[PDB]
Amino acid sequence: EVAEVGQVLSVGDGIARVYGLDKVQAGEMVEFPGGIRGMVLNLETDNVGVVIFGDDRDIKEGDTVKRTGAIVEVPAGKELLGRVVDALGNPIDGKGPLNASERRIADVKAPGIMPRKSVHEPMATGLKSVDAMIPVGRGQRELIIGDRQTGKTAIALDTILNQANYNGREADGMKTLHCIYVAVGQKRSTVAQLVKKLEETGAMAYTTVVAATASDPAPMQYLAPYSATAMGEYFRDNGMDALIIYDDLSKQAVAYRQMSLLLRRPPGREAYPGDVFYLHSRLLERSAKLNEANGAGSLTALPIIETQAGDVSAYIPTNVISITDGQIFLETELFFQGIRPAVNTGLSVSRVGSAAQTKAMKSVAGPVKLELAQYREMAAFAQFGSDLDAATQKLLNRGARLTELMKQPQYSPLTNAEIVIVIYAGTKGYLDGIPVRDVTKWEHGLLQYLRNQKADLLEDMTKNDRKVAGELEDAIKAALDGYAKTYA
Amino acid sequence: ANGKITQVIGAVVDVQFDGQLPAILNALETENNGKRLVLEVAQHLGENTVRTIAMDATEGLVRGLPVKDTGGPIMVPVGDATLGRILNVVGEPVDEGGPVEATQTRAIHQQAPDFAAQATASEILVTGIKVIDLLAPYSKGGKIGLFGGAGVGKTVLIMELINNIAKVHSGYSVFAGVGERTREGNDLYHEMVESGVIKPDDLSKSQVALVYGQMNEPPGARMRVALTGLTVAEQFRDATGTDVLFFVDNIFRFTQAGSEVSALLGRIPSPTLATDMGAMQERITSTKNGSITSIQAVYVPADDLTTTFAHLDATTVLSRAISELGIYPAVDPLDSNSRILDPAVVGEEHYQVARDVQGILQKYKSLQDIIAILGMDELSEEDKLTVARARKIQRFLSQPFDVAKVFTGSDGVQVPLEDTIKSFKAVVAGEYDHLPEAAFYMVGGIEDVKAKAQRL
């Protein structure tokens, strides 16, 4: 007829102008002929602007558009663990139906002021740089930002892989961190390779992948972060912990800009829509730490932004920096030189800080970011080749070794206990008599020594979290002395 | 009488009317799936249709829904019922503390106070905080800027200002949280509960009313939520005739939200971005029947790392260097400054003592590298003396806060303006060179220094 049904006037570029649909509400899902879904964004006087989630080349002017009578919602629950889905929650891994027992609205208002609790629990990436210098907590939002090929995706994947060491321990005071990876505008092949790594390590067991690839239409790229957040909110709202990774939000903003301009909405700054900040702010506000009265669950976010030529002053980067609780800036010049993870110590920060660390980590990690920022400043000064006094030389020698200690390859996360001892070793002068060349070699042997010869010390630090002082410090000193004798 | 929704384009909602066309800035009401939705009139489009900005989400709105014209602008609860509560932009409680049972309501948009009843000449607002009152005094009706990163006692300062205006002036305070992180909004509330500026069990005796429109909220809400806060502050000024504080964290977000709204209504886009208020500026002023003083938490997107006047009458610069010397509050006594630090406003004595104190601290700073590298014996006798007075003065600028009492145990203090001027004048003259340095640390006026000296 006209009220509950409409007629397609025009169609193209993932958008459709539809006559009729008088009783359709804004943001409502609609059905096109061949099972193709779409969302109503523009209610106009003489038409309805629809953003199309499926393939638009099938649709032709004249077709029947039908109301679903519901706002865009997606499946959720533990049934999505192990699975790869699109932005609407349809599986794309060929492993049969999802069979979810719950459904959630994709784009929703974040929890208010009262149900929250201060972030006080570690969300361990397993990387020495991040966990010691820019520690992420459960319920925090921590931006990962930098150019292409600065290792942003690799940091996020390592974080997911690290959780296996602490997961499935619903007994020793350890909630499982369920992971949600969101691919937005990546190549299909790049996602397949990431999934392949998750499955072969076993990390797929506790992970859900949501994919809106470069080949998928812009409305799926726009939606995927919201839909995946709703999937993450299942855990947060039912007394469980989750992690979500938006890889990346630069392409969600690009997708949003395309849809908006195709709906003839006005251009804002850099041609993005006027509320492009609100796009990301309402998303990231949904990541939170709830109090005991609301189940004590949490959703942590690692949003990713791609800069161009290190331009962190750009518009979309500036927006997301002003949203999150600190950032990890990965730099091209450091990456080019093999300093990986390529953490710029001066620009990177965690606003949560020590609250997101263990007592052990807190007791040794404190001065490390400042020392490494100062070191890099001094090394830059040393290039000029003016006179360096003995005190300056001592810092350069120390910081060069600390730089090597912060280097870390892919797929090789360390536990909290392991990082604490490595940080202790560097800061207390145990590598001073070891050449700069051989620091990573020296570290590799130490970790093997610690895992084989002092597993009891590592398990003791894990379960009985204390500051590195008194008896625990003697055990760490002895462990390092013991290792020093094997290396000699 | 009523109108109906013709279009919905995100936050932008068009409403066609039959009878009287609603004036610009009028609040309209409509039912979005049961819950009421406020809309604010922006433009008249012709064909008897107005163009509005929503104050909440527009998802679920249908064309044809009836829309009521309220007659005036957005109205919000005011008076003592707001004390200790958190309200949103349209005056609804967002603190889960039940209904705001207020007797009066007031419009968020209001014309400025005219030249009649504006208080003649600039006038000091005594905070009771020695360093501020002496070296960078706040003015009534003035635009104050708090500068500082994390870990320098910025929230502790804000709460003591709330405390002191209640204690020494019988005034009120309003904190407007605009487009900031809800995580940090939660922390601020519970920090305010800890130190007693908000009292959950006796809310009317709280010293501040909160108005929150954080990052999670749409452009229209974040644009107007500051005005909602100002209107609550205006009521406290008019009703009691006292000196009221209007805290804004922060103006960059206020402007950002306004910029979002402008862009959505179809406007082409192109130092003062952080500090420039809108027409809001005219409502911040000192009258015969009290005053509203703006204390703004100065912010830009400078979350990477931790400058001069623009639209400000005074600045309070919190310093990490000053904090690490044990000086609380961590105010930089040289980088902080005021337009009313001028003999024509504060008097000849006030100005001269402040100038001498600055001169001594400046000279002390010039001799800092010599004292660190070589001894105090390296200095001439004349310069040795000024360092001794400077070191006393540094400590004497520090002060214990009533708000800090829950953490430290020590009682706070508010020092009268004259006590501050006379005490520092005496120290500058050298009347108390004989007293030890520790006596000047963490006390009120000079009589507390004498009392502390006798204890040692």
Numbering used by the authors:
A (entry chain A): 24 to 511
B (entry chain E): 4 to 273, 279 to 314, 320 to 469
Paste lines from the article.
The P. denitrificans F-ATPase is an example of a eubacterial F-ATPase that can carry out ATP synthesis only, whereas many others can catalyse both the synthesis and the hydrolysis of ATP. Inhibition of the ATP hydrolytic activity of the P. denitrificans F-ATPase involves the ζ inhibitor protein, an α-helical protein that binds to the catalytic F1 domain of the enzyme. This domain is a complex of three α-subunits and three β-subunits, and one copy of each of the γ-, δ- and ∊-subunits. As in other structures of F1-ATPases, the α- and β-subunits of the F-ATPase from P. denitrificans have very similar folds (r.m.s.d. of 5.1 Å). Both are composed of three domains.
However the crystals with F1Δ∊–ζ as the starting material were found to contain a heterodimer of one α-subunit and one β-subunit, which had formed by dissociation of the complex under the conditions of crystallization. The final model contains residues 24–511 of the α-subunit and residues 4–273, 279–314 and 320–469 of the β-subunit. Despite the presence of ATP and magnesium ions in the mother liquor during the formation of crystals, in the structure of the αβ dimer no nucleotide was found to be associated with either of the subunits. The nucleotide-binding and C-terminal domains of the β-subunit are in a conformation similar to the open or empty conformations in βE-subunits in almost all of the known structures of F1-ATPase, and therefore the αβ interface appears to correspond to the empty or open catalytic interface of the P. denitrificans F-ATPase. However, the αEβE interface is more open than in bovine F1-ATPase because of contacts in the crystal lattice. Thus, the global r.m.s.d. of the αβ dimer from P. denitrificans compared with the αEβE dimer from the bovine ground-state F1-ATPase is 3.0 Å. Although there are no nucleotides associated with the P. denitrificans αEβE catalytic dimer, electron density interpreted as a phosphate ion is associated with the phosphate-binding loop or P-loop region (residues 169–176) in the nucleotide-binding domain of the α-subunit. It is bound via interactions with residues Thr173, Gly174, Lys175 and Thr176. The current structure should be helpful in the interpretation of the structural data for the intact F-ATPase.
